[model samples]
Target: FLTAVSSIDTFLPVLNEAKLQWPTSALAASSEELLGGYVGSQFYLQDGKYMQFQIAGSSNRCELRQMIPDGGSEIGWAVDDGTTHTATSSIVVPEQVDGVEEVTIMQIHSGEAPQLRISWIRSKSLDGVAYEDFIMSTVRIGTGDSSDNFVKTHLADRTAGAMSFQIDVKDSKLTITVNGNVVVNGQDLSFWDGTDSCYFKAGAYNNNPTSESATARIKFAALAWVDHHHH
Candidate 1:
């Protein structure tokens, strides 16, 4: 038996919910069904601002939380469950900033079993300090199988300026680039296939986490399954 699938809507509903306005024509009309499902969304940050998006998924339910910074140290977090899958928040820093500063979008995947798909642009700095330590790392459990493991990627080292990065486990590779320049060209890596499930988190780690506090603005973030049956 053969099954064919296509996305009739040019605009993905999840993108609209996240307020990530992009031309509907940018996305392909449709593609083959890869896995459980897919998600894509964006988040923006100005100078001295921070934001966070959290997602919770389970066999029976899913949830999302959006947190925005408030005052200098306090933050305002709003919660929404499976029914209310979207939220937004923002933060502003004080004036008289002399040293380096940054903003970041953090995605935390918590649960015994979960999968994640992430893509984004890395922020640039006027200073010459190369913050390349920001790379994705994974942690796993159980035997040395492919499914029981952890995988992560950092946004800083992918490119010097804004870029696009994608990971499709079913394809068994990670692709990243800057502007039009291909920085991290399709590296063979698999985060799933060993464990029953694992937790995933993607965020920015500043070389100067104290003096700088690196910021990451997210262009797209989603969770989907990569069908390994074919691979």
Candidate 2:
């Protein structure tokens, strides 16, 4: 029960909105104050239906992007023609200030590189406190810098608290699920084929760029995205 759901079109009913990337240059407020809730302070909308994402430490972002465009620009969903996409999020990474090893949360972009990444690491530290792990990074579309084609997987920990992940894409095949557990199944994204635009991202992106006192609070009671080959 990852809770948080009051409305966002009844929790992303075929979503046609969502575009935020905090670090502020112009995370421009209003869409009812950025997603009908809170803005300015790195996004939040608590009690009314969770969506909290805070950041600090060499800041990178407090994201919530979804800009799938390339052929069907009315906003979202095109992925270079071979439809079928899904992005469901439900995280709860309470806080992450200690040195902040990684934070990413969720992702799938093609036009901005990150082929896929779902992070939260800081592994090991048993009694001194510093336990976290839930990784899955993949970038192999003839990669060459995004730090080159790498593949990783760990998927679980942070005590496995509250996570209900899902990131699916079709035709090229790429799957990942957690809580319902499929761990990174269908794999092979047909080598991204130089995708033009195919997106989806979720909160607290900080990856320790030299961390400035570190901080990260992430929680998205539930978020959604879907194309399902749109009829």
Candidate 3:
């Protein structure tokens, strides 16, 4: 939705064009600088996103998340009474630019039980993989390590440019479809009873922070979510 202008150490706008009050948290609340490697709040996109830092140089547990109609603290995922829930967005895995190496493009997280990890793409890894080839990772914490069955090759292989993706949770089942294919059709999420809170976040999370500094960029062509699950 936005582009990187400059000042790689700046923070991104939490709200959209409507200025509907989108909240964001980071290491530097007041002044965001491209701090590298964990001296304190070490995450930086290094001059990209038009003045933003979804880039995680050595940052961990940093999230540029988006909340729903209301903050998730009061209502968990379960309190809702809708039949199904879905999220749609067109994400462009920007071409491998300079400044850094190996990055986790974006992580799609759901605040379900123990928090259900939707999915994230690994555009470039430290293993010396090409930025073009993106690897998909999933963590079904509610269950054991059986996420493989559901989390298939969503955007498998050298996928670049804009790739439209979707996530649908219904009837105790979680389905993820990319472009038009159902990549992750997982079911039996026992803990998804919905009593806990849930939300979505898609920001740059760096995996390998080297000696110098680095950052990754992703273009969210568009983002939309429908949450009638508790309507």
Candidate 4:
């Protein structure tokens, strides 16, 4: 029994008729007989204004809320699960920033559990307090240390598309791709490196087949701060 629907005011007029661009965020899921049950949604595109979170579950516990700019808060959290869940959280902002104003995700399902995914981006600092956390999930890769948890690394052969990670920090390195294939490669890994913000999950590690759920079609793109370091 988990239900919360607002769709951020009907998806903010369909994201203002597809205007696009401005503190972005988007997530979509609709299975279980196509929204008859187990539906999901989360969208936030500020300035022009758009905030939404709609969820329903049989085993998918959900939580998502955003608004940290009146002096700032939250520095980290990341997750991407196709299957293999074990997530913990901390560092939701307060390291250093020049980007990232809002980003949120929470989905917990048990009993036939196999779908918990993530895609995130953060960085905001210029006296607005602090913030920096970049996450890409489908079960671990890098960034986030305080005991380091979530680093599985194995992308490919998960049937249902969509998986991406890019932190070029001027080619300092950190790129993981699936459905595009470049499977984990870590070099300098920038974003001021507060170790590398962590927290992304899925279920039944190593034994695999916990019901196999890591379907995709998710996207997130960001640029600013000199086009995020010049192109």
TM match of model 4 to true structure: 0.23
Model 2 lDDT per residue over 1-231, tens place:
222222454444422355565774235432333434444456655666667777776647777666433222324333435777788877777646567777887787655467787877766443355445545455455567553466666767764356788887777778888889797788776667546566777787777545666777787777778655554
Listed per candidate, the RMSD to the true structure in angstroms reads 16.1, 15.3, 8.1, 17.8
Q: Tell me model 1's lDDT, rounded to 2 decimals.
A: 0.27
lDDT of 4: 0.26
- On TM-score, the leading prediction is 3
Over 19-137, each residue of candidate 1 has an lDDT whose tens digit, in order, gives: 21111112221221111123232222222222222111111111222111111211221111111111111112122122223322223232332233232222332235544324332
Select the stronger candidate by lDDT from 2 and 4.
Answer: 2
Encode model 3's per-residue lDDT on 1-231: one tens digit a residue: 232322232222222211111122333321122111121222333224322234534543333454433333212343133557566666666555554444443343454222334324434343354444554645354445554433333345535656777777666676777778877676455454654455555545554445234545555554555555445
Candidates' C-alpha lDDT: 0.27, 0.63, 0.44, 0.26
Which ten residues in a row are the worst by lDDT in model 4? 222-231
Model 2 regions lying over 4 Å from their true place: 1-9, 12-49, 52-81, 86-96, 107-115, 118-138, 141-148, 151-188, 191-216, 219-222, 228-231
lDDT of 4 at 80: 28
> Candidate 1 — worst ten consecutive residues by lDDT sum?
54-63
Report the number of clashing residue pairs per model.
17, 0, 12, 26
Best by lDDT: 2
